Design a protein around this nucleic acid. Structure first.
Ligand SMILES: [Mg+2]
Ligand SMILES: [Zn+2]
Ligand SMILES: [Zn+2]
Lengths: 1288, 240, 48, 244, 158
RNA sequence: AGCGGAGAGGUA
DNA sequence: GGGCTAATGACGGCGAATACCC
DNA sequence: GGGTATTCGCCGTGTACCTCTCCTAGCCC
């Protein structure tokens, strides 16, 4: 029932209710999107969709068509560690099979000659490493998700942005996937205006005339037209309501068409025109104001109905009539050339060119390409029943006159959809029928793009470039391999994966930071918003974010709200929207079924919150439950609810759930603590958190820094570098072997290590851990240590968020971290001569040359210091005594320059990597390390072959108890081992890839183990950051009544100011846990029985979730008691459990006080304090902001050549920028001579700084100031603008 | 903790009836982090606008330098205590202290100290003419007597001090920290100012026992006044 | 032309042909002379 | 004034003014070649239009033509703006004899004095240490004096302690919105890597003690030292510039 | 590249003035500013580290690359000053004059300054009493100008 | 061998 | 593989050209 | 000729510091 990892250690867990749904895979969305994009294992959507969309190519001269039947992804030529160490990219070749056919001209179409060029090389696709990372030039990059605007149609408005009036204007925008944007804007004079791609605005009458619509047809379709009589008119009972008893009397009477005088006809607009064949002229135009002469002509003609338009003040609006009155164009060709002149300014008009441009602007698949999610959003916003539709924008009048083959198929399925008139009519009913608008703040209005969609987009861009090349290349038609060019698609995929706003450098200092960086979503990007723009409307949280987007995990700085984090149970839907699970709630009892609802479907049903009490197993005993309907709180009876939350961890993310007592802390301090945990550094010995949550095991499992056993078995062969398991007959021919990484640098210059934890000869199951990773316990996540805390002011050393440390926290090496630096020595090729790595360097003493070998580089495992020469490199810089010295020696006497690699940070050298190019003779040390590598691979290949032969012989001995396949399997394993050894020997004997111009590269790994220093930044767990003031000996620290000295003395003044009190409960729970651990150690120190330990564990585990103690063993119970000798870890859920009574009971179980406050004595004078302070163990960690990285100074360094000023940054000896506000402060002081010697003498003047330096070193005082050189630069830059500036 | 506020302006119908000592629900924590994000965005834009206003005010007032010790300007400025219909904004003892006087209330061209402010408070003075920098007759500078005393030192301002950059920086200090019926509150005698009720501008100022003005209300046209007036009453009841 | 609309003040000074008398605080920082406020007032008194 | 920056492998970084100058020179040479050829009016009209557009892109790019994924800088953008030659090199300049470090709290210090690290003060007061080593006679040349400084014996600590005794330094907060963001202190040598500060100073600085860094500056002239002693000392700046 | 004898002398510039005058520049004054005329848009030749003659980076117009050195190498002494070499014509002087000297371009056709036209207080529009759109159409070669001040379409000009 | 333009992350 | 080779997710304040009937 | 009424542009929107990557690469042999 319990695995070996759970049997090793059991933590106490108390809460309100149990968890129904377990924690899913934390990195699932990226690997599922990349698996859907690759299609490595069909292949309907993904890369195959873009390959099927682009590759049909029709040439201009005909008889040239390109077809394909599929694509194959080749195996990578290098390993993951091979691309990590050598510097290559972990990519795979993409090969397609292009089929080229040639038709016969001036005859019927037939396949005259068809070829099939297999293995067409194009691009290299970087594969994932199983956790969401890929190696790009030796570095791991993480592409985060993008939260952009979903395609479709939206209706927005502006509040007081124009006309300075209370009336608001509406806007309709059609956002496609890869097409040109369409807009529909109103006008304060009641008119409609449209524009394409933010161009000059035009009325919609030009677009409707270019579509092919007449004014009479659009007036009959938009406005409801009534009839007239020859004057009289028809009576409408609904039209008389606008002008209740008179309308009811007219409805109950049932009147006919009554007579009406001519005073009602002058205020109307004619809908359709009237003509007379006897006269020969038009008696009335369409859509005009009626006059007396037009009425006289209509009476003389003898017309029956002239037509009218239903015009109201609020229910109806004559916007199309005013739009036709504004635009004077009445010709379709004039409208088309007006659209062509608005699109391309400064071009002569052409009929068929503008016709092809208007056809390719909106009504084609190669340019517009509206996606299916945009079609679904379009049909959901308009109100159509059908969901899936055409991928191109359809019109009823435009596609009716087309003669293409696809147009007849499109007109038969859509059957006059007319989406443009549908959008205009929906906007008209928004303006007139009093409809509601939607703002872009919901998670259903937004969409999530993963790495696969952006990779398919940049691959489609590269394929469009390749198609544009091949359309010219296939004009005169040879093999298809000479047509397809891999260079533009390779450059596009390299520019996407190398340098992009979505592909950034990751951090690998902590597993929690790795998990929250792979799960991070970001609204920035090429289609996203900018941080510099005013984005206050999107930085605030929306009620749709509950359950899908974490709210309290938000970085500090400019991007507060633009860079969000995904929730725990949140996942991506099939269309890209975010979804969260719920529970199916029947009337009464609640069924435990999981249904993932989208963001646009959660507002329709009443969803109850997770904070709902239940007396039975599944019921609702509350008359008013705290449910929500539209994101706000509501009190509803339980007979109307439909859904409920599955877990209280649904709101927070994986970085916000690991901090205990989140319900007792403020939101700002929780926001600080969720970001402070991502900067922790792994120490030498990591300790488990005494006050945890339970989600640390899922984060340590899904982080990937630890290894796990796929098949359980015997671990009888174990080493510090490799772990060999032996599977059983049920899981299995060869056994599995796991290689552990020992010492390699991460992306943040930290050390990662995998130390094993299993023993010799113990059975395991599938899923147990075998080696604890960096900053990782036996299955829990470990960030910091456990140490005594006292909240009291101590002589001003903990004054304002300052931290006091004892000598016992330093002398036991608790915060000692290992940092691995990368120092390289590059030997370029110059025109005067190539630089060598020789050890004989002039003007260098023997004290810096003893550590150098005969190769010129340093040994492995040599203690170096700051300024030591590690790699000796010389370069040639080019009287009869010099000729005599050159003739006495072998042309290596003089004319050399010393430029070697020095240490900037003292430590030992752990690895020396030497890279050489082909054609260069290898060094004896390079030959020696080559012999070492081939001996190592021969040794471990022989050991693996011996283990496989021993397993095969054991299976053969087990098979002959009661005969040929084991020998064939052993022969196949021997052939595979020989092929792998030949591949490794051929890989490590050839020259690596280098830049053009470098002959040799030497990389030296330097490992520095830094201790803790006064001034280092160290934060807690709840967001209480601090800086170490000084190191105090143990004799001055305050001690308790038993003699235990407190390590850290914190300040209690921050508690009422920052308003967080979860740290006090964490201190009390850590004090209770340390008391329980001391009681267990005191029980196991003497000769005690097993029953006393059993009843003590039964008392401290459950009190009446339920942990049985009579299940495992007696020896397993002794192992559990030995594992609990450092402390009993407690599990506190993020929004339930851990009340005051439970903490008081765990305090009262041991010999500990109830209030958690004991009286401690001062160590300096031996007297007693007046009050009792809170003493306990708090999980305190160390940040990455060191004191060595930030402390730097300079006197005189290098200067720039554009302007005579010092450089900037800690590197290259940069000076501090004396800003403008500091100059304002010095001018506020007065300070003429201080400000003159600050920006002229010290910084700008060339001769002035030399004169001041020599006057300092000589003793005399004669300061001569001068003009800054940047003023002369500004004068020379102004004079280049043909503007004379003279210094009179 | 009471009710929580939403950024659109509406208050939530249900409050948070739980402190940080007890547990908080998820619907209360949602409003808590909503208010926290609103406050963080508010102080970010406040810091940016304060920096821009500080830069603009520094670049506007940078030519004013104390050049001469005396100018000879007898224009003056009348100082009154600022009452905005409620509690006092700036009293007389803060607004008067630090500058010289123009007309005899006291001797002209004399720097005022705390003893002179205490003597004027014992004498119960209401308005004193002051010498300000808005009425100066200097050539490209401010007189040393019109500015008054320094703010860093309690003595007179020295000749050559740039009083523009200090003033602009002091105005730009707290920018990161920014955001019918006449019934009297305090007791004291009521003294009408500019009255004739047929009055265009009416001021219902009161005088306390020490001689300072605590309350000052506005009176519209046709305000009926009922009235050594005690507190808790209404001098002007209503005027619709 | 120090903080806003450098092109407009530059073309206005180019058309009008103005002459900067350096009687300020920021232009003495740009040119590189002493500040005419505080300890630098005696240098400006002795210069003119 | 417009130099080329080289990269690894012989490549050069791209420039903004050089491409505009090459475009102007190339279009002017094309106009001269079309004028010597006696071209018709349409071709020389289009060439003069291209010359006017290239001159417009050279003088003020981004106004009408916006010549280029990112628009390159011109002569007009190099003067105006925040990143121009007027705000980054004239009002605010990079200075030497300066450094920064984190700050802690020191309760044993006085109001007029502050702490300073040993290696930081050795790097800042290096010319005075060199002058005192030349005056004491421990080194004949400055090369032996520099090697004796990097050797780090006790005599260079004696020289550094004798130099820093009556020499004030200017401590500055990285935002300087306050008038009292720059104050002068007499530094002492501490055995650490941070800058200890008096607790009565950080109120006027508005500075906390969690990741706060403060840049220091040393005045080296006699007038600057006396100005820092007189009108920049922390004991002289008691009252606030806003109120009394 | 490296020079140590010229580096020791100081107090060469007094930098003492009273006022700063800014005005326009005549083409004769711009011609008197420069020292040479550029003709080719070539900065650095390929496969060699040498500047191009009559280019943007040239030694005959602005100054030599190395200090007290020519492009060919006929004069390699500090005693030679004010002498122009015969093969590649450059002065044997300090290498700091490359930061001070400038060149000029002879345009085949005159162009208009965009700082006097594109600004909203337009100076050429106020001096010629014309609107901004007319001068924008004339300067971009879309119409004609009579010489009294009216616009002309090319068909109307015909 | 020194002189640099973008993009990303983090601290006050 | 190789060496020359010429987008449309901001927002507010403000001075200047069109439209037009009296 | 002359007053409102929109309307197209012009011009701006905090400082200081610390890490990392990637830079014009394309083509017909
Ligand atoms: Mg701080
Ligand atoms: Zn005055
Ligand atoms: Zn020469």
């Amino acid at each position: 029932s319990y695995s070996f990892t759970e049997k090793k250690r059991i933590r106490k867990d108390f809460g309100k209710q149990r968890s129904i749904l377990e924690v899913p895979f934390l990195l699932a969305i990226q690997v599922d999107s990349y698996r859907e994009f690759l299609q490595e294992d069909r292949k309907d959507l993904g890369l195959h969709a873009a390959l099927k969309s682009v590759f049909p190519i029709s040439s201009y001269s005909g008889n040239a068509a390109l077809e394909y039947v599929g694509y194959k992804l080749g195996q990578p030529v290098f390993d993951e560690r091979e691309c990590r160490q050598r510097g290559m990219s972990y990519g795979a070749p993409l090969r397609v099979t292009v089929r080229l056919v040639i038709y016969d001209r001036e005859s019927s179409t037939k396949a005259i000659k068809y070829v099939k060029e297999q293995e067409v090389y194009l691009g290299e696709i970087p594969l994932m490493t199983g956790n969401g990372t890929f190696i790009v030039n030796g570095t791991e990059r993480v592409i985060v998700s993008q939260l952009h605007r979903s395609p479709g149609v939206f209706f927005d408005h502006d509040r007081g942005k124009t006309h300075s009036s209370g009336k608001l204007l509406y806007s309709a925008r059609i956002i496609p996937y890869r097409g040109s944007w369409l807009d529909f804007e109103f006008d304060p004079k009641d008119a409609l205006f449209t524009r394409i791609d933010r161009r000059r605005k035009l009325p919609v009458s030009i677009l409707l005339r270019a579509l092919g619509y007449n004014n009479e047809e659009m007036l009959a379709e938009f406005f409801e037209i009534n009839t007239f009589h020859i004057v009289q008119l028809e009576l409408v009972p609904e039209r008389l309501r606008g002008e209740a008893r008179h309308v009811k009397q007219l409805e109950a009477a049932g009147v006919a068409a009554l007579a009406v005088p001519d005073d009602y006809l002058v205020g109307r607009i004619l809908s359709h025109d009237v003509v007379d064949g006897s006269t020969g002229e038009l008696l009335a135009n369409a859509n005009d104001e009626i006059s007396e002469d037009q009425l006289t002509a209509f009476r003389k003609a003898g017309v029956d109905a002239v037509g009218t338009l239903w015009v109201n003040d609020l229910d109806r609006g004559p916007y199309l009539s005013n739009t036709l009155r504004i635009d004077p164009t009445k010709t379709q060709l004039e409208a088309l050339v007006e659209i062509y002149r608005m699109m391309r300014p400064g071009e002569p008009p052409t009929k068929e060119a503008a016709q092809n441009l208007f056809h390719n602007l909106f009504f084609t698949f190669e340019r517009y390409d509206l996606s299916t999610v945009g079609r679904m959003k379009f049909n959901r916003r308009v109100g159509r029943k059908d969901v899936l539709g055409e991928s191109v924008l359809y019109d009823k009048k435009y596609f009716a006159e087309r003669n293409d083959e696809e147009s007849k198929r499109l007109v038969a399925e859509h059957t006059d959809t007319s989406d443009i008139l549908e959008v205009i009519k929906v906007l008209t009913e928004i303006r007139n029928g009093r409809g509601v608008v939607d703002d872009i703040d919901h998670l259903g209005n937004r969409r999530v793009r993963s790495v696969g969609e952006m990779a398919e987009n940049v691959f489609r861009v590269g394929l469009v470039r390749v198609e544009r090349a091949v359309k010219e290349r296939l004009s005169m038609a040879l093999t298809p391999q000479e047509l397809i060019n891999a260079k533009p698609v390779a450059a596009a995929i390299k520019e996407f994966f190398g340098s992009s706003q979505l592909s950034q450098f990751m951090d690998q200092n902590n597993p929690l930071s790795e998990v929250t960086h792979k799960r991070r979503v970001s609204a920035l990007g090429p289609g996203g918003l900018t941080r510099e723009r005013a984005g206050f409307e999107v930085r605030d949280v929306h009620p749709t974010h509950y359950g899908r987007v974490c709210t309290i995990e938000t970085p500090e700085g400019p991007n507060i709200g633009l860079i969000n984090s995904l929730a725990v149970f949140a996942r991506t839907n099939q269309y890209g929207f975010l979804e969260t699970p719920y529970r199916k709630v029947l009337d009464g009892k609640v069924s435990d079924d999981v249904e993932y609802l989208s963001a646009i479907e959660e507002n329709e049903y009443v969803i109850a919150q997770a904070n709902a009490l239940t007396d039975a197993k599944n019921m609702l005993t509350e008359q008013f439950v705290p449910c929500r309907f539209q994101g706000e709180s509501l009190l509803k009876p339980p007979s109307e609810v439909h859904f409920m939350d599955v877990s209280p961890m649904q709101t927070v993310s994986v970085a916000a759930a690991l901090v205990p007592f989140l319900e007792h802390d403020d939101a700002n301090r929780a926001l600080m603590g969720a970001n402070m945990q991502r900067q922790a550094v792994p120490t030498l010995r990591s300790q488990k958190p005494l006050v945890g949550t339970g989600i640390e095991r899922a984060v340590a499992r899904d982080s990937g820094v630890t290894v796990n056993a796929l098949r359980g078995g015997v671990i009888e062969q174990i080493d510090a570098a490799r772990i060999v398991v032996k599977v059983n007959e049920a899981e299995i021919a060869g056994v599995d072997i796991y290689n552990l990484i020992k010492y390699t640098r991460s992306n943040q210059n930290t050390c990662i290590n995998q130390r094993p934890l299993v023993n010799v000869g113990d059975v395991i199951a599938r899923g147990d851990v075998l080696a604890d990773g960096p900053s990782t316990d036996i299955g829990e996540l470990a960030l910091g240590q456990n140490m005594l805390i006292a909240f009291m002011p101590w002589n001003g050393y903990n004054f304002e968020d300052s931290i006091l440390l004892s000598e016992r926290v330093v002398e036991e090496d608790r915060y000692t971290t290992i940092h691995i630096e990368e120092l390289t020595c590059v030997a370029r090729d110059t025109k005067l001569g190539p630089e060598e790595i020789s050890a004989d360097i002039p003007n260098v003493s023997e004290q810096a040359l003893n550590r150098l070998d005969e190769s010129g580089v340093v040994y492995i495992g040599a203690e170096v210091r700051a300024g030591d020469i590690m790699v000796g490199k010389v370069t040639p810089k080019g009287t009869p005594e010099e000729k005599l010295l050159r003739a006495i020696f072998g042309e290596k006497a003089s004319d050399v320059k010393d430029s070697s690699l020095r240490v900037p940070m003292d430590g030992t050298v752990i690895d020396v990597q030497v890279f050489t190019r082909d054609g260069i003779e290898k060094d004896k040390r390079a030959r020696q390390i080559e012999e070492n590598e081939i001996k190592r691979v021969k040794k471990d290949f022989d050991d693996q072959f011996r283990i496989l032969e021993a397993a095969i012989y054991a299976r053969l001995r087990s098979q002959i108890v009661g005969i040929e396949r084991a020998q064939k399997q052993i022969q196949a394993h021997e052939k595979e081992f020989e092929a792998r050894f030949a591949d490794k020997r051929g890989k490590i004997t050839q020259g690596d890839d280098l830049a053009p111009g470098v002959l040799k590269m030497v990389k030296v790994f330097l490992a520095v183990k830094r201790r803790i220093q006064p001034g280092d930044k160290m934060a807690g767990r709840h967001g209480n950051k601090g800086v170490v003031s000084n190191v105090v000996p143990v004799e001055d620290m305050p001690y308790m009544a038993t003699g235990e000295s407190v390590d850290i003395v914190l300040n209690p003044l921050g508690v009422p100011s920052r308003m967080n009190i979860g740290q006090i409960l964490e201190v009390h729970l850590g004090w209770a846990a340390k008391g329980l651990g001391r009681k267990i150690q005191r029980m196991l120190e003497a000769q005690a029985a097993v029953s006393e330990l059993r009843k003590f564990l039964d008392d401290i585990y459950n009190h009446d979730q339920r942990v049985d103690l009579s299940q495992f063993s007696d020896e397993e119970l002794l192992n559990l008691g030995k594992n609990l000798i450092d402390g009993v870890p407690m599990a506190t859920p993020v929004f339930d459990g851990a009340s005051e009574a439970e903490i008081k009971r765990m305090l009262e179980l041991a010999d500990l006080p109830q209030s958690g406050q004991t009286q401690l004595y001062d160590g300096r004078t031996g007297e007693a304090f007046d009050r009792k302070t809170t003493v306990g163990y708090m999980h305190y960690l160390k940040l990455n902001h060191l004191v060595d990285d930030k402390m730097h100074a300079r006197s005189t360094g290098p200067y720039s050549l554009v302007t005579q000023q010092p450089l900037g940054g800690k590197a290259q000896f940069g000076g501090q920028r004396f800003g403008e506000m500091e100059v304002w402060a010095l001018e506020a002081y007065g300070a003429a001579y201080t400000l003159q010697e600050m920006l002229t003498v010290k910084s700008d003047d060339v001769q002035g700084r030399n004169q001041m330096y020599k006057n300092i070193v000589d003793g005399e005082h004669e300061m001569v100031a001068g003009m800054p050189e940047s003023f002369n630069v500004l004068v020379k830059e102004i004079r280049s603008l043909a503007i004379h500036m003279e210094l009179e | 903790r009471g009710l929580m506020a939403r950024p659109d302006g509406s208050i939530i119908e249900t409050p948070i009836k739980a402190n940080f000592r007890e547990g908080l629900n998820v619907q209360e924590y949602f409003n808590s982090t909503h208010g926290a994000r609103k406050g963080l965005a508010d102080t970010a834009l406040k810091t940016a606008n304060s920096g821009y206003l500080t830069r603009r005010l520094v670049d506007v007032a940078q030519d004013v330098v104390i050049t001469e010790i005396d100018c000879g300007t007898t224009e003056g400025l009348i100082m009154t205590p600022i009452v905005e219909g409620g509690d006092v904004v700036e009293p007389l003892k803060e607004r008067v202290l630090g500058r010289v006087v123009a007309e005899d209330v006291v001797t002209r061209n004399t720097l005022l100290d705390e003893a002179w402010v205490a003597k004027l408070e014992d004498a119960s003075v209401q308005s004193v003419k002051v010498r300000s920098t808005i009425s100066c007759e200097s050539s490209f500078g401010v007189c040393a007597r019109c500015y008054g005393r320094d703010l860093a030192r309690g003595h007179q301002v020295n000749i050559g001090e740039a009083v523009g950059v200090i003033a602009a920086q002091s105005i730009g200090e707290p920018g990161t920290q920014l955001t019918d019926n006449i019934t009297v509150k305090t007791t004291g005698s009521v003294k009408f100012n500019n009255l004739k009720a047929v009055s265009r501008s009416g001021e219902l100022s009161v005088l306390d026992g020490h001689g300072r003005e605590r309350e000052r209300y506005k009176l519209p046209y046709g305000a009926t006044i009922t009235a050594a007036v005690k507190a808790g009453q209404s001098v002007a009841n209503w005027d619709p | 032309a120090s903080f806003q609309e450098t092109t407009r003040v530059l073309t206005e000074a180019a058309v009008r042909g103005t002459r900067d008398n350096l009687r300020g605080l920021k232009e003495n920082v740009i040119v590189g002379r002493l500040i005419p406020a505080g300890t630098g007032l005696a240098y400006h008194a002795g210069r003119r | 004034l417009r130099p080329l920056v080289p990269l690894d492998g012989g490549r050069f970084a791209t420039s903004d003014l050089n491409d505009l100058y090459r475009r102007v020179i190339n279009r002017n040479n094309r106009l001269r070649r079309l004028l010597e050829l006696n071209a018709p009016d349409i071709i020389v009209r289009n060439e003069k239009r291209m010359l006017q557009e290239s001159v417009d892109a050279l003088l003020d790019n981004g106004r009408r033509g916006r010549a280029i994924k990112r628009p390159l800088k011109s002569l007009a953008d190099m003067i105006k703006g925040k990143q121009g030659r007027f705000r980054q090199n004239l009002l605010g300049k990079r200075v030497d004899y300066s450094g920064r470090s984190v700050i802690t709290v020191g309760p044993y210090l006085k109001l007029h004095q502050c702490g300073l690290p040993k290696k930081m003060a050795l790097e800042l007061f290096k010319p005075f240490v060199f002058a005192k080593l030349q005056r004491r006679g421990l080194a004949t040349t400055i090369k032996a004096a520099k090697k004796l400084v990097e050797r780090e014996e006790a005599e260079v600590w004696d020289i550094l302690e004798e130099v820093i005794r009556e020499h004030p330094v200017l401590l500055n907060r990285a935002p300087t919105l306050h008038r009292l963001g720059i104050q002068a202190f007499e530094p002492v040598l501490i055995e650490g890597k941070a800058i200890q500060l008096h607790p009565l100073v950080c109120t006027a600085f508005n500075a906390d003690f969690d990741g706060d860094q403060m840049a220091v500056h040393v005045p080296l002239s006699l007038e600057a030292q006396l100005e820092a002693r007189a009108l920049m000392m922390s004991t002289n700046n008691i009252l606030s510039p806003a109120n009394g | 590249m490296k020079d140590l004898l010229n580096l020791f002398n100081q107090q060469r510039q007094t930098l003492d003035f009273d006022a700063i005058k800014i005005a326009l520049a005549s083409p004769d004054l711009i011609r008197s500013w420069s020292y040479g005329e550029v003709k080719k848009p070539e900065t650095i030749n390929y496969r060699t580290f040498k500047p191009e003659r009559d280019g943007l980076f040239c030694a005959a117009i602005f100054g030599p690359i190395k200090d007290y050195e020519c492009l060919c190498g006929k004069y390699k002494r500090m005693k030679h000053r004010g002498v122009v070499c015969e093969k590649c014509g450059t002065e044997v002087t300090l290498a700091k004059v490359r930061r001070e000297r400038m060149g000029h371009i002879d345009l085949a056709s005159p162009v208009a300054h965009i700082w006097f036209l594109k600004s909203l207080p337009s100076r050429i529009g106020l001096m010629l009493d014309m609107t901004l759109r007319d001068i924008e159409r004339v300067l971009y070669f879309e119409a004609y100008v009579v010489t009294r001040r009216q616009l002309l379409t090319e068909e109307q000009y015909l």
